[PDB]
């Protein structure tokens, strides 16, 4: 086994890991691919998402050529710290983890020609600026940008290993998404100009579509049932002032409870979302059903109900039994067609 | 190989414990910041989180090299072998340098000896916010940059590029705040251990009112309006007018309770508190108005309709007048 020990000692003899390969001679070309083991949950409140990847980088270092019984050295990852590696970082990363349980989750393989393969297991939290105007029927393109921290494009360039569409692969059953659907991803590469120079940036946009099922169950269905309940009052006799006032005030309190609690998981945006409009309109219908009874009660003459002369069924009530359900159905037709 | 020999000679005999010009004039350090994002502006924790690219420039003559017309961008581990300023943030609470895939740090040398040293830092800096006009308040959050152990006789800070030393503020988009301006201040701070150079980066934040209109102001306005409906109901409908009056009082409590749970326990009255108290008084007085009407007819009868007709004007007029004084004072 001392043959392979002597090969490693020769490689590291007089080797400077402070210098990128080809420094002052050529541009270091780094080929990258990403295997997404899990696309983690998306946090709307923080406008961030989590992704777990195998981040693979490959480049050629002529100082690491060797001859031996094997053509590839599948080495302990501690060998990585003794050689030069790319200083890749994620531009939109917030707080990432390079896993090291039970050992640093890194592999290093050296081919005899001097090509290096260097992969690591990462958990990246990345910024995804969301536009929530169409929430909860919104779609987002969450980016994942990475590149060199220190080396400009005249020094280090990044490329995708295979075709860009094939250089980012997501595992078949690795979705940790709860309320989003990963429709697909687009792979690109660009250039960023900063105060320190011009840098290659490799981008991947993950296209996410929110699932509406949770908000139908917990927001849209309760709102609709509160509107339907508020219109049950129209079918009670006008001499039921306490009963029809309870209908009006409880549904208004219910809509207020729904309204202030529907944005609890969202960032406090200044603009109004699609769900805000639906709740505001449902509030108007519920508010108008209590104003309607006030008008009916104002034209009630006698304080006794039908068992002398008796009150008549209100014309306002007769038309409200039709107009209110009809206009709420029309709103739902326009609302859902506008956003779906 | 020439570069490798050059770097070894630079680091051979180099003393990291000594600053450049250790026994001479102070080393001038130029700083610029590229702000990547501001987030988590919290009134509960009284702090904001800032991600930035923190660049420091200084000339260390021990690192001057000749023969190479290149700027030597070295591996970031060489920073541990060089002298770097002991710069720190005074109001920083929790701060880390990003370390994926490697430590987000850069060292770039120049032939004359100039060192460019960059770090990607996320820091949570304390920002004590005065919330007396909340949610119509303007906050001023600062970042205080200081040398820890070197006084003004050993080190000097300046903003490299003047007023253009900080970039990226125009690209920041806060969901709840708008940045009005940012300033760069250079000054000295004296402690018991000496005078120290300080650089200040302050932002002025204006809170967006749109969220609070839908969340607290509009439900309070509509509930206050709804309590006037009792003025149009007959005096003898005690069950209906008490149910309406008490429900509007209960509704105002729910609005305040939800708002209270999202805020730090501050000892003074905020602007939004003043509005909910105003709306509560109007809702409370409408309920007390019926009790006055009920007492006059039943406890004193042995004009009832005048009081209700009078209230149909005064309550809408006084509440609109209250909104006039409130919004003129705070907007």
């Amino acid at each position, epitope marked *: 086994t001392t043959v392979f020990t002597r090969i490693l000692d020769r490689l590291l003899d007089g080797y400077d890991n402070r210098l990128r390969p080809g420094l002052g001679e050529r541009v270091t070309e780094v080929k990258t691919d990403i295997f997404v083991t899990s696309f983690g949950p998306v946090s709307d409140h923080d406008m961030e998402y989590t992704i777990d990847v195998f981040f693979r980088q490959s480049w050629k270092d002529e100082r690491l050529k060797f001859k031996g019984p094997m053509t590839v050295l599948r080495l302990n990852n501690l060998m990585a710290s003794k050689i030069w590696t790319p200083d890749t970082f994620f*531009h*939109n990363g917030k707080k990432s983890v390079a896993h090291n349980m039970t050992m640093p989750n890194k592999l290093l393989r050296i081919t005899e020609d001097g090509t290096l393969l260097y992969t690591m297991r990462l958990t990246v939290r990345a910024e995804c*600026p969301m*536009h929530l105007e169409d929430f909860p029927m919104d*779609a*987002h*393109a969450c*980016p994942l*940008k990475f590149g060199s921290y220190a080396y400009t494009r005249a020094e280090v360039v990044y490329e995708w290993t295979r075709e860009p569409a094939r250089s980012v692969v997501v595992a078949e059953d690795g979705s940790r998404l709860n309320q989003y659907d990963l*429709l*697909g991803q*687009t792979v*690109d590469s*660009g*250039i*960023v*100009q*900063s105060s320190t120079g011009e840098y290659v*940036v490799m*981008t991947t*946009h993950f*296209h996410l579509k929110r699932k509406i099922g949770y908000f139908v169950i917990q927001t849209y269905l309760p709102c609709i049932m509160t509107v339907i309940l508020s219109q049950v009052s129209f079918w009670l006799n006008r001499e039921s002032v306490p009963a029809r006032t309870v209908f009006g005030v409880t549904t208004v309190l219910t809509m207020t409870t729904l309204s202030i609690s529907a944005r609890n998981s969202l960032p406090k945006v200044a603009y109004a979302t699609a769900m805000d409009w639906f709740i505001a309109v449902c509030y108007a219908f519920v508010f108008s059903a209590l104003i309607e009874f006030a008008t009916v009660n104002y034209f009630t003459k006698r304080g006794y109900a039908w068992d002398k002369t008796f009150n008549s069924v209100s014309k306002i009530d007769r038309l409200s039994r039709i107009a209110f359900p009809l206009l709420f159905g029309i709103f739902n037709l326009v609302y859902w067609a506008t956003y779906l | 190989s020439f570069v490798k020999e050059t770097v070894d000679k630079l680091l051979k005999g180099y003393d990291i414990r000594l600053r450049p010009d250790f026994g001479g004039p102070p080393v001038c350090v130029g700083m610029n910041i590229d702000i990547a994002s501001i987030d988590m502006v919290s009134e509960v924790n009284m702090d904001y989180t800032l991600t930035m690219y923190f660049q420091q420039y200084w000339r260390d003559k021990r690192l001057a090299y000749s023969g190479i017309p290149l700027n030597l961008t070295l591996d970031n581990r060489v920073a541990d072998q060089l002298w770097v300023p002991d710069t720190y943030f005074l109001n920083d609470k929790k701060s880390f340098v990003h370390g994926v895939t490697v430590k987000n740090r850069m060292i770039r040398l120049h032939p004359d000896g100039t060192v460019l040293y960059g770090l990607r830092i996320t820091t949570t800096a304390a920002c004590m916010m005065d919330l007396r006009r909340y949610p119509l308040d303007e906050q001023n959050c600062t970042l205080e940059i200081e040398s820890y152990g070197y006084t003004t006789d050993d080190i000097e800070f300046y903003w490299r590029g003047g007023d253009k030393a900080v970039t990226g503020v*125009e*690209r*920041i*988009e806060l969901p709840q705040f708008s940045i009005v301006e940012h300033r760069l201040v250079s000054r000295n701070v004296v402690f018991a251990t000496g005078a120290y150079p300080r650089l200040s980066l302050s932002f002025r934040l204006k809170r967006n009112i749109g969220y609070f209109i839908l969340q607290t102001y509009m439900p309070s306005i509509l509930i206050t309006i709804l309590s006037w409906v009792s003025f149009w109901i007959n005096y003898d409908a005690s069950a209906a007018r008490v149910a309406l009056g008490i429900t509007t009082v209960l509704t105002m409590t729910t609005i305040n309770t939800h708002l209270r749970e999202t805020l730090p326990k501050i000892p003074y009255v905020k602007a939004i508190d003043m509005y909910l108290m105003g709306c509560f008084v109007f809702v409370f007085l409408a309920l007390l108005e019926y009790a006055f009407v009920n007492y006059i007819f039943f406890g004193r009868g042995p004009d009832v309709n005048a009081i209700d007709r009078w209230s149909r004007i005064v309550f809408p007029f006084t509440f609109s007048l209250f909104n006039l004084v409130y919004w003129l004072y705070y907007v």
Partner: nanobody
Amino acid sequence: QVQLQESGGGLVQKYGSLRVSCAASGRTFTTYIMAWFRQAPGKEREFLAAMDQGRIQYYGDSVRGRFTISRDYAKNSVDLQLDGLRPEDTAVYYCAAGAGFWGLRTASSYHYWGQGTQVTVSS
């Protein structure tokens, strides 16, 4: 209402330098991707350049290294510098802004479009 107004253009001599600027109003596009497209006569819209909130520049292959895209986030504007102009570059240049859903190079991802500036190169 949201409006995007291109400026510059007209006629330019071969090899001339032209700067095309776009002014946006009615909505702040700080978090959006502001792009440039061109449409040769009898041809589909061709992606030229884009620049997102992080100042990352994307380019089409035919214009990479020739055209430069910059943004004035304070002025809510995007500019496209045209250099090495050739008669093949004569088209209608469009300013666009969008969230880049299903790709920032596809024209269907941009919701806001300018009217269009005619750029012509005479040889």
